[PDB]
Amino acid sequence: LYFQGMDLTKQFPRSPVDRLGGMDHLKRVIDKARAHVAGTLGEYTYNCPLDQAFFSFFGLDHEKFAEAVKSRPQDQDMLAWVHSQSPRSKNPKEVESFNREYESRSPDSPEKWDYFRSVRDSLAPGRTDITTWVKLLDLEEKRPV
C-alpha cells in the first residue's frame, strides 16, 4: 500500500492552474501519480495526453516521476526532484511558455468542439465563456471559474 495514496473516486486532483514552482499541471499530476501508484485513479488517467504534454515539455519520464513521488510526500520535495531532472523547468520563461500554451488548449477539431460543448452544457450550460480544456476541468471539479 502507499502512505500517500489518494482515491480519486472520492477526491479531485488539484487544479490545472494551482501552480507549484510557477508551473501549471505539476500539482495535478503529482496527485494523479500518487493515485496511479495506489491503484485508485477512478475516472482519471495517469499518463493520458495532458500528462504526456507536461512530461514531454520538461523531459520527464512518467514511470520515474511516479516512482519519485513515493519517497517525496511533500510538494517541495517533488518540485526539487523535477528541477533535478529538468533543466528546462529551472527557466522561468520556459515554465511561463508551457503555462501559456497549456492554458490556451482548446478542442482541436470540430468533432472535439462538439464533445467539449456537450460536457460543458451538462455541467453549466450558461457558461459559453468557458472554452479551454483546463477551465472545463475546474468547472467539473467544482472550483470557481
Q: How many CB atoms lie within 10 A of CB 90?
A: 13
- End-to-end CA distance of the chain, in Å? 35
Residue where the block lists cell 459559453 = 128
What whole-number distance in Å separates Cα of residue 123 and Cα of residue 118? 9
Q: In the chain, what are the domain boundaries?
A: 1-145
| Residue 39 identity | G
Look at residue 20 and give its three-state secondary structure: strand
